[PDB]
């Protein structure tokens, strides 16, 4: 019979988070304020100054070759040209905290590893279980422990970057020639004396190699954690992924490459008020809303913090009390299970947009007019979106509600991955079924249609709402008043989304609509 591993792990994590909650919360406060202060300090430094400083350090470290300093200056100038500075500074602060904590917690661990033969046996298994574990796991408990922000990035980077440092430390202390140790013992060198006189000054090469690996791992894990808090270039590349935006993804990847090469090359050359905290989910529908919301909401004098992450996390984020609110809550069916979990831990306001039409989507030219009239078109696939989405609750139930779909497959993707896959299909002019919703922009470029749902489970009376943590009316009424009024047209929202897909910036397109409808916008501010 099956064993309840999942239940055991969840129960243990719940018991922890209910037990050490105060320590986690105080760590959250201290760490977030610390990292924010460091980032403000670093970005207070103008880009030209810090770029020149780093190029000077490059020159000092190597004065003969002009390759590294040149690459450094050119790349950093390029980054700051693209506008990716503040994000870069957040990335650096995350990486510094991660690397320092990993070193501070690993090198001592390498000591207690090498000086004992039991501890190696205990830990090496743990190191192998940590060093192949995927990064995605490490940031699940992080949210469960500290919640959204920079703290999760730091914690995940710590736990994912510790292994190589510890391993290489234990290797470099266990590999010094036995004659030297035997001598240092023959002269009566206490463990401290030999450790600070013989072990380290010889193992430093391996230790620094392990530290370089630790830094690489922390950097990659920050990029990954971008899905939860973890500001910086990770958010940019993640959004480029969840929207298939090749240009921005390439830009953020090249900037991370520049940062990582800089840090690497350095390492091998040092061996010898009215505020609002909002949440959204990178969906072209919800990018339009919040971005427009923030740009306008700023005008009244509101301090903004938008946080892009996944749907169910946001509900938890808004639920436990870690954020103000969010306007991306499709309801009462697409995101209902989310409500069954954390619908009780909010204070719902009311709709913000009438007419949220959910359903499948197929090219108009194709014959099928309803899902019941589907035999085996498109390799029996359902090219959908991220598995944590809400329609996947519907689609999972859809395939398990009708007969003809009993042998059809659901294949998740991103909310923008299918759109390019769709465009490939229409250019290829092949039948293809895709999970979909409205409002959306591809309807304005292609000739597509929904499929009538005779059972209507996947959504009939659908309408976006917005939620806010309980008692926020007593802690930030200005946004509570503003958010309550946030309800606007269904029809030409799309200008926000059609303009962007044509080649404009989200804020630039979000600005333009507000000028057209400033009168309606000011209604929200009341």
């Amino acid at each position: 019979g099956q064993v309840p591993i999942a239940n055991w792990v969840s129960s243990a994590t719940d018991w922890i988070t209910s037990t050490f909650s105060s320590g986690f919360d105080v760590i959250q406060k201290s760490g977030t304020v610390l990292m924010n202060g460091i980032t403000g300090a670093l970005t207070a430094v103008p880009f030209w100054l810090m770029i020149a400083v780093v190029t000077i350090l490059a020159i000092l470290v190597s004065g003969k070759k002009i390759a590294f300093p040149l690459f450094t200056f050119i790349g950093l100038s390029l980054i700051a040209n693209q506008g990716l500075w503040s994000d870069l500074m957040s990335t650096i602060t995350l990486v510094l905290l991660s690397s320092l904590l990993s070193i501070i917690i690993g090198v001592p661990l390498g000591i207690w590893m090498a000086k004992s033969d039991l501890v190696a046996k205990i830990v090496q298994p743990i190191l192998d279980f940590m060093q192949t574990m995927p990064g995605f796991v490490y940031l699940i408990p992080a949210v469960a422990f500290f919640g959204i922000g920079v703290v999760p990035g730091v914690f995940a980077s710590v736990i994912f970057a510790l292994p190589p440092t510890v391993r290489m430390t234990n290797l470099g202390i266990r590999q010094v020639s036995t004659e030297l140790v035997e001598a240092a013992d023959s002269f009566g060198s206490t463990a401290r004396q030999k450790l600070f006189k013989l072990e380290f000054p010889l193992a430093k090469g391996t230790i620094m190699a392990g530290v370089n690996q630790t830094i690489m791992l922390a950097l990659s894990m920050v990029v990954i954690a971008s899905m939860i808090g973890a500001p910086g270039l990770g958010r940019g590349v993640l959004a480029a992924v969840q929207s298939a935006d090749i240009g921005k993804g390439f830009v953020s990847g090249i900037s991370l490459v520049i940062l990582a090469i800089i840090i690497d090359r350095f390492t091998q050359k040092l061996n010898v008020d009215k505020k609002v905290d909002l949440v959204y989910m990178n969906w072209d529908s919800e990018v339009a809303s919040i971005n427009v919301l923030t740009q306008a909401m700023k005008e009244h004098g509101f301090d903004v913090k938008t946080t892009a992450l996944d749907n169910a996390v946001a509900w938890q984020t808004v639920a436990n009390g870690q954020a103000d609110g969010m306007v991306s809550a499709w309801l009462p069916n697409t995101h209902k299970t989310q409500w069954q979990k954390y619908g009780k831990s909010v204070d719902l306001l009311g709709p913000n947009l009438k007419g949220a039409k959910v359903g499948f989507v197929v090219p108009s030219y194709m014959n099928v007019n309803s899902i019941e009239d589907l035999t085996n078109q498109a390799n029996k696939t359902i090219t959908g979106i991220e598995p944590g989405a809400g329609v996947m609750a519907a689609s999972e139930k859809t395939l398990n509600s009708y007969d003809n779909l009993k042998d059809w497959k659901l294949v998740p993707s991103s909310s923008g991955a299918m759109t390019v896959a769709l465009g490939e299909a229409i250019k290829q002019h092949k039948d293809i079924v895709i999970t979909g919703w409205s409002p959306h922009w591809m309807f304005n470029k292609y000739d597509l249609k929904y499929l009538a749902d005779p059972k209507g489970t996947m959504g009939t009376s659908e309408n976006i709402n917005t939620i806010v943590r309980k008692g926020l009316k007593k802690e930030n009424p200005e946004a509570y008043k503003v958010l309550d009024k946030f309800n606007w047209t269904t029809k030409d929202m799309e200008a926000v989304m059609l303009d962007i897909q044509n080649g404009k910036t989200p804020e630039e397109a979000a600005k333009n609509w507000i000028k057209d409808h400033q009168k309606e916008v000011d209604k929200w501010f009341k």
Partner: protein, 382 residues
Amino acid sequence: VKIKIEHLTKIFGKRIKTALTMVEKGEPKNEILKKTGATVGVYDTNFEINEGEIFVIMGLSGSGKSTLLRLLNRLIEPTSGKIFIDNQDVATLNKEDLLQVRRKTMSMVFQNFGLFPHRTILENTEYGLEVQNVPKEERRKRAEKALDNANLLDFKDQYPKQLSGGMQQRVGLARALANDPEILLMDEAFSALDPLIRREMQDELLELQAKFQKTIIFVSHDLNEALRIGDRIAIMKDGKIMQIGTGEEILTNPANDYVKTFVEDTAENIMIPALTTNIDVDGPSVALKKMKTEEVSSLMAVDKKRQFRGVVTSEQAIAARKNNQPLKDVMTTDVGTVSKEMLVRDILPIIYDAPTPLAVVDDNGFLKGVLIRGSVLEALAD
């Protein structure tokens, strides 16, 4: 007397109390291994050492002799036994007292010089004091003093890697001496040097020990390296075969039969590699250079094709050089030539008249070796 040992022994592996009990009865090592898998390197060792008594410890790779050293210094904790130094045991000592004993009395020397490459010679030399928490000027004073005693102070402020084996060994020995130890343990110290430098170091060590009367637990697998310097030897095959020492009693009254093959106590297999001079191409000056390098006064002379031809002498070569006359004319063809294992002892008379040896020339004219009063040794062994 300085040291005194009692039933000292060391057992490796696991489940060893059974092995300790076994050696407490007298079971051989091989039975212990096959029964428990607990290899033993020392076995019921009992002896004593005096002051100034260089006490060599011979044996073969596998005798567990260096282990005995490291047990004396307790780098390897003894499985059992006692070590009475200064009327003070050593296997029952807390950490700090053992530590002071290591800092003051004992001191160590290693095969591969045990030197820190991340330091300059002086720092290595003073390490023994550096670890004793003493002010630095006296440290540097004693370091430079010891180096000056080894004629390489100018080679300080440099790194071992840029030196040769001999100077590294001198540095290690000085590092040992800086402490003013009453003892000096060595683990085949000179075994990594060239045999020439090995002899030089042996002579220097004897000079030192004459000047400095301190005990020395030497270790070597070369019986020469022990007879030269050793005042009392102890041979080891997993245990003490015999250590009567005094140099001959290993040779005169070897208790065992193994020792008699370890020290290796008829026919002309005693011939030795010869010193040759190929006259047809080389000449007087080359021959004299060979004599100088080879530290002799005469040589054996052959034909280009390795046929023996005769003998040459320093005066003959000098006359050839001054006269410009070449070899093969001023040369000694007449010689008491001999065959490989065919003139064992009938040669006793002839070897006496001729100061030069008697080449054991192959019957076909080839040469294998010579004989230099090694015949008188086993002619009288009868």
